[PDB]
Symmetry: C2
Subunit: 187 residues, 2 copies
């Protein structure tokens, strides 16, 4: 049976950091649900791309649990994720059940807001490091993708393919990741 | 005054190849119109991401001309672009006025269908090379981004940042491209 991913899409999300993981995970045969934080309605991303989610978050939660919960970046998307009680509970439950949490760019700052994964080695976008490191609850990394157990983090739009393929490897293994990678024409 | 880009979005487009150029061009201060081939309605991309276009193609044509016309890839998106009389006329007019045409992955095969840019050096996705080369109307390149005058081509999802930054350089210059590139965390 296939693995399943929940991608939580909020206003102001970085659209590249949303679409690249969704697309790459679907290429890997992962069943992905793009869930709208606010509801079922289209979401205006950071650079004004408008994406229609598959479901509301409320409804997508009904259908969990998921093998990975993915939080895109973008500041403002991350801020919306960080303010959400629904996201708090999803992340807490995912941590409790020992499931993977993957987030990119400013997205890891939602982990901070919701007290998830403290003590982990993490990376973020360079511009999000100070926010992530407030209180010293994580150890910082400049690796393009960082994984400390069940906390997978990455840095920015330009690390999104690497991030997505790291999720694929974690869920479906190295061989599947390599097979998905080749047709992408990555360097 | 700002440069302007038309991105033509058809069913089956590769969503990464759509969003990465839109986002990067907007970061460069280019005024981008995401125009739906079929109309105003949301578009189901190749990996099922649903994107709401800014306008129909019909309406976007009213507001041209544009400094660049961008065609995403995806086979099936490219096939829809290749079958469209509206796209034929937009590309012919853009070629006549000596404006840039930029396309990626299978997207260059729409140039073939509409008899655009014959004699140019081009690249495509490897899987689209045979279709592009039918009749020997172009000279093939394995460069990740190829530019022969006003015909700019590129290979796949994993060359989309390079492709987008090549458009930015062509329209807004090298310095702007470098400034846009740095926050992306590209390798």
């Amino acid at each position: 049976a296939s693995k399943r991913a929940l991608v939580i899409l909020a206003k102001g999300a970085e659209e590249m950091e949303t679409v690249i993981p969704v697309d790459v995970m679907r290429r890997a045969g992962i069943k992905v649900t793009v869930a709208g934080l606010a509801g079922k309605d289209p979401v205006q991303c950071s650079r004004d791309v408008v994406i229609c989610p598959d479901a509301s978050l409320e409804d997508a939660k009904k259908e969990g649990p998921y093998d990975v919960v993915v939080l895109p970046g973008g500041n403002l998307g991350a801020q919306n994720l960080s303010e959400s009680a629904a996201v708090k509970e999803i992340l807490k439950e995912q941590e409790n059940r020992k499931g993977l949490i993957a987030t990119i760019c400013a997205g890891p700052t939602a982990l901070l807001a919701h007290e998830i994964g403290f003590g982990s080695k993490v990376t973020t976008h360079p511009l999000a490091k100070d926010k992530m490191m407030n209180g010293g609850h994580y150890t910082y990394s400049e690796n393009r993708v960082e994984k400390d157990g069940l906390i997978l983090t990455s840095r920015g739009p330009g690390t999104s393919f690497e991030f997505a393929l790291a999720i694929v490897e974690a869920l479906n293994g190295k061989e599947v990741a390599a097979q998905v990678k080749a047709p992408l024409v990555l360097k």
